Nucleic acid binder design. Sequence first.
RNA 1: AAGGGUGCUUGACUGUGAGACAUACAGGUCGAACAGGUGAGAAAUCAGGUCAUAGUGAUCCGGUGGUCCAGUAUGGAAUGG
RNA 2: AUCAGGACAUUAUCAUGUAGAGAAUAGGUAGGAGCAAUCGAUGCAAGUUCGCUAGGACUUGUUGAUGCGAAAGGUGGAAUACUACCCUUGGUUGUGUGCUGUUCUAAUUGGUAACUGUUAUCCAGUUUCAAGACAGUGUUAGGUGGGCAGUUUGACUGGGG
RNA 3: GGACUGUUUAACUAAAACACAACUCUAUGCCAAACCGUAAGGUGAUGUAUAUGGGGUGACACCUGCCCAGUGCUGGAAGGU
RNA 4: UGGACCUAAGCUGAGGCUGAAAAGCGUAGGCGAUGGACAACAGGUUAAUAUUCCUGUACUUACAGUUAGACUGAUGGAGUG
RNA 5: GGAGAUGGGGAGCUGUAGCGAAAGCGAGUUUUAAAAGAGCGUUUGUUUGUUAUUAUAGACCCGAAACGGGUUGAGCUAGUCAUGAGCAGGUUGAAGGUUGAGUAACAUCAACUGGAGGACCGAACCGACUCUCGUUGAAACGAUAGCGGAUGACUUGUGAUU
RNA 6: CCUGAGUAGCUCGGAAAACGUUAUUUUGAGUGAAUCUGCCCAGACCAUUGGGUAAGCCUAAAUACUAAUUAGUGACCGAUA
RNA 7: GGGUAGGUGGUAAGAACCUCAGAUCCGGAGAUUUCCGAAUGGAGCAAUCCGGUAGUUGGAAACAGCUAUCAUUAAUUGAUGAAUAAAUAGUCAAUUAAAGCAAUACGUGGUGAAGUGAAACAUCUCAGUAGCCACAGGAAAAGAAAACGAAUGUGAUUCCGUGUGUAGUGGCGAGCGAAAGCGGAACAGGCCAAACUUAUCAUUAGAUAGGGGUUGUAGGGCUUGCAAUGUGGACUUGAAAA
Lengths: 64, 149
Amino acid sequence: AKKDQLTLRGPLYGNNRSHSKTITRRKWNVNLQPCKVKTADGKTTRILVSTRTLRTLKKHNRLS
Amino acid sequence: MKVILKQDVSNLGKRFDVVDVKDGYAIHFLFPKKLAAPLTKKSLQDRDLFLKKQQEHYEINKALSHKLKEVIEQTELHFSLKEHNGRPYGSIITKQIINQAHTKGMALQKFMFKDNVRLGFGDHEITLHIFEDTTAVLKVKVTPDNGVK
RNA sequence: AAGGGUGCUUGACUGUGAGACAUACAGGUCGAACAGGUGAGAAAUCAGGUCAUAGUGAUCCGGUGGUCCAGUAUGGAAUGG
RNA sequence: AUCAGGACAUUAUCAUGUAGAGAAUAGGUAGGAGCAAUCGAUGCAAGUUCGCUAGGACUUGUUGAUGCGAAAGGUGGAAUACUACCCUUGGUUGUGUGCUGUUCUAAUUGGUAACUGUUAUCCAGUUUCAAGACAGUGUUAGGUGGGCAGUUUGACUGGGG
RNA sequence: GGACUGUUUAACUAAAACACAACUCUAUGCCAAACCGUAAGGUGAUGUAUAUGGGGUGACACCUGCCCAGUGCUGGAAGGU
RNA sequence: UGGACCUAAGCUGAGGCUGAAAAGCGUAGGCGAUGGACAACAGGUUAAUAUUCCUGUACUUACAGUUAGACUGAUGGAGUG
RNA sequence: GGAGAUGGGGAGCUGUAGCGAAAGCGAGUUUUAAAAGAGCGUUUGUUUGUUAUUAUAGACCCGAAACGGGUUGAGCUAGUCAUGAGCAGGUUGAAGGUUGAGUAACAUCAACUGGAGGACCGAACCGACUCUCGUUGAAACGAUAGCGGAUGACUUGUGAUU
RNA sequence: CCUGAGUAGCUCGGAAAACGUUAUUUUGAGUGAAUCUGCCCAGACCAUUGGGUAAGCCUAAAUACUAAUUAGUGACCGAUA
RNA sequence: GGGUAGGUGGUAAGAACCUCAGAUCCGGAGAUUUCCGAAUGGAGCAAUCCGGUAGUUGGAAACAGCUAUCAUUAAUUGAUGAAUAAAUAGUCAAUUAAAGCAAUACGUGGUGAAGUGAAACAUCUCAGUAGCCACAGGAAAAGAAAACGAAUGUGAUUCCGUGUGUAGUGGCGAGCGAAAGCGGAACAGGCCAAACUUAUCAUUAGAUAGGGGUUGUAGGGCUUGCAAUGUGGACUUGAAAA
Ligand SMILES: [Mg+2]
Ligand SMILES: [Mg+2]
Ligand SMILES: [Mg+2]
Ligand SMILES: [Mg+2]
Ligand SMILES: [Mg+2]
Ligand SMILES: [Mg+2]
Ligand SMILES: [Mg+2]
Ligand SMILES: [Mg+2]
Ligand SMILES: [Mg+2]
Ligand SMILES: [Mg+2]
Ligand SMILES: [Mg+2]
Ligand SMILES: [Mg+2]
Ligand SMILES: [Mg+2]
Ligand SMILES: [Mg+2]
Ligand SMILES: [Mg+2]
Ligand SMILES: [Mg+2]
Ligand SMILES: [Mg+2]
Ligand SMILES: [Mg+2]
Ligand SMILES: [Mg+2]
Ligand SMILES: [Mg+2]
Ligand SMILES: [Mg+2]
Ligand SMILES: [Mg+2]
Ligand SMILES: [Mg+2]
Ligand SMILES: [Mg+2]
Ligand SMILES: [Mg+2]
Ligand SMILES: [Mg+2]
Ligand SMILES: [Mg+2]
Ligand SMILES: [Mg+2]
Ligand SMILES: [Mg+2]
Ligand SMILES: [Mg+2]
Ligand SMILES: [Mg+2]
Ligand SMILES: [Mg+2]
Ligand SMILES: [Mg+2]
Ligand SMILES: [Mg+2]
Ligand SMILES: [Mg+2]
Ligand SMILES: [Mg+2]
Ligand SMILES: [Mg+2]
Ligand SMILES: [Mg+2]
Ligand SMILES: [Mg+2]
Ligand SMILES: [Mg+2]
Ligand SMILES: [Mg+2]
Ligand SMILES: [Mg+2]
Ligand SMILES: [Mg+2]
Ligand SMILES: [Mg+2]
Ligand SMILES: [Mg+2]
């Protein structure tokens, strides 16, 4: 599914309000992007994570 | 973001220094190439306290790199004969990592980011030149011979 | 005469308003009289728009001016009345 | 990641401007009566810029201690040297932003080829080739969009229109 | 009238309607355009412009005239919003 | 006639890919005849069965012992099918 | 406390003072310079039982064509795919080939062979153009008599699929 | 010396609360703090006063319901109910 | 165990038996429990078909009886091991759990309409209802203040009455509608991270296993003393009693 692999945070369903306040259901998807996380110098899996989790990994010196 | 670097880079710094470089060049180029290191001991004052050991750490990794240079300069007959027509068809089809199938593990590691060889990796039937850079001052010259099995 | 001319002026006022007309309601019409301060006139008196009947659109919403009201603990402000 | 370009601001640095008269190329407002000489003049030679074909200014080389009527004459609305602030315009080493224009690879992409898992057209890993900070994807914002959906399309009326 | 052989509204319309071989225009350089899905995946196609998709006309013969004002489509320097 | 033999369209499908969830797609494997391969014919009999029971004459595939000869040769390659 | 009457429980609710948008004042208050004038007040309660009406619920009963969400259907039929089967019988006699004449050599002509056609007539088979009958039928679409195609863009069995 | 960071805030689209988005709560994209003289709150916001310690976890009781087992009740029905 | 003089289930008579060494019957605890079905050796058109492995008994073997076992996923462990030296991916084996169903009922979460009303309709309502899906439990959810809120104030959550159809919110239309406070039901508060310290990991630990700590009238750690050996739990095993 269109979801993170480190965390489980997924899409956010909401309303698409326009002028005249017309209601139409819409879905916000997470910014899934591919990244490779080294683990004990091995198993550099190409996991699909969000940019928020990517920033967390970057500030943690690639720790997960 | 703040990064301390190890080796010599044309811009930014010389050996130790603290440079504010974008994460694109740090997490994708400077870090895998061992040309830089992340926050030392996780802070700035921590870096200052640990710099009195980082200097000697740089000394000893350079020292083992010099040892690595000696190990290639000792045993070096790592050879390879190609299977081709030979007379009108001469070209080395080993790319680079077939040669790294004879360096890393069997002999001195000679990592893929260490050998600064050209993109043709040799296309001749005679002795050639391999250039490898352990550091920014050491130049490695290897002479492999080629031929037909 | 309620038509024409001349002189001086701005009552084409402020707060109101007993009593009536006509009306399903909402609205409309006439109005004596009181207080304040004025205009004309010697004064009495007249003037709350025109000889009279058409010339007009509710509520909600937002904007403008004034303001002796409110100001989400208190002083302001925002935002309202 | 790097290079080149022009743009707007300035750290440091120069200059730049002609109504007449005014010995003249007068951009305005002040202190303002003296000022120059190894932070080196008169005469000369060359050069970028500028042009009123005359002139301003900057830079280099010789020169040598004598000069400024552009202090004091005089004109003019604005007046002269020196020390400051404020306008038009150009160059300079320099940073701060993006704008098109290249090159490079490590992000990333592949319905190029090969090997392995593997007796396997998928998938995964490792390469190789081709692209490459593009593309694709997420968020935001314009344009087109009966492809699709929800609705509206009044009353009187010798019946309705 | 339709070129023809054919197809069509099971259970009121078999026809001049649809289709057909043929003509023309348009899109598409291949991970092609187009299409099903939300996406993966797949059709196109294990095909490669002598190929594929869509619009129109409908054997064969002779012809297909004028208008680019409006709309649609394509391209375009700068300029205005 | 069909399984214990084999595959076509297609279905299912560990891993795996995709997707708010349910699920969709799909590889290796496994199913799936309307097809391919495989040894029995004639007559008689009961109220009801008969290439099935009976009579007559045959054929095929396995296992063991034995005799004689020969080196045997597939989960794979090729031909045929 | 008996699935009780009820006892405890005063949380609260209505009335007791009204006026004003409100701060506020108070048998007064709002408007206003006003005390004048005008508006509102200067008194008649509450809790239950029964009846009538009304508000929210489907609200006196029956009746839509519809709309939205989920599942079941390609055994009929329409298309596509896989594997099979069928078209009695009789005619017309193409392309092509061989030979001969002919041509400078082609072209062309004559004979023989060959058996093609979205060919022809006509049964099974497929379809349904017409009259009549039937219309609470033999039948929720047929019967008799004619009719079109019938080697093909054909008909049909089994299996799968949208 | 320690007291929970891609965290609280802020911006762009939504939502939860009675509120049709707004002080408080939450989040799809982006950015991003401080460390008891600290941080959050008292319906925009600032200052004074006061209240409370976010970004870690677990928590019985009163509460919701009856397919079933035992006993029992009914101003409930008595073969169209 | 109780309890008897009858019993062999109903449409059901008869035939034939059982039963006083205590039957039938009732209660507690066990035994057996074919096949399909989560179905799980493989398949499949459910109650069918086709097997493998390890034993054991007959046969001269094929074979045939009688047993046990053989699905997938996840976690742990061990062995083996590619591209490619090492190492992972992968493969195999062992152990432990998960699958499913139902109570036409309650809970939580995700997704989520329309008929209808507004006398039309699009904001809105209907309604976060129906439906679809996931996870449970005997209840679930919530929960110990970065709180209410205006005071010499209350001091987890949950549920009931009132506050009130109030403040407010609404094409300010149809409508929607709390949070304080007060009266009741019940009542309970606990525990980690960081400091600091111990031991061990080529101690590059930034990791593992312990002691210390759990806060707001700030708490804890650092150093130094007094007083303490108790009270109470949401707590383990037993024994006894009602
Ligand atoms: Mg709606
Ligand atoms: Mg007059
Ligand atoms: Mg007059
Ligand atoms: Mg309005
Ligand atoms: Mg205030
Ligand atoms: Mg593909
Ligand atoms: Mg991009
Ligand atoms: Mg848009
Ligand atoms: Mg439209
Ligand atoms: Mg429409
Ligand atoms: Mg509607
Ligand atoms: Mg009408
Ligand atoms: Mg008419
Ligand atoms: Mg008439
Ligand atoms: Mg025709
Ligand atoms: Mg016809
Ligand atoms: Mg018909
Ligand atoms: Mg007909
Ligand atoms: Mg695609
Ligand atoms: Mg293909
Ligand atoms: Mg036509
Ligand atoms: Mg025509
Ligand atoms: Mg024409
Ligand atoms: Mg034109
Ligand atoms: Mg255009
Ligand atoms: Mg089979
Ligand atoms: Mg068959
Ligand atoms: Mg018979
Ligand atoms: Mg009582
Ligand atoms: Mg009075
Ligand atoms: Mg009374
Ligand atoms: Mg069919
Ligand atoms: Mg024919
Ligand atoms: Mg805040
Ligand atoms: Mg809401
Ligand atoms: Mg404090
Ligand atoms: Mg406040
Ligand atoms: Mg805290
Ligand atoms: Mg009954
Ligand atoms: Mg009866
Ligand atoms: Mg007994
Ligand atoms: Mg509606
Ligand atoms: Mg309506
Ligand atoms: Mg209505
Ligand atoms: Mg709980």
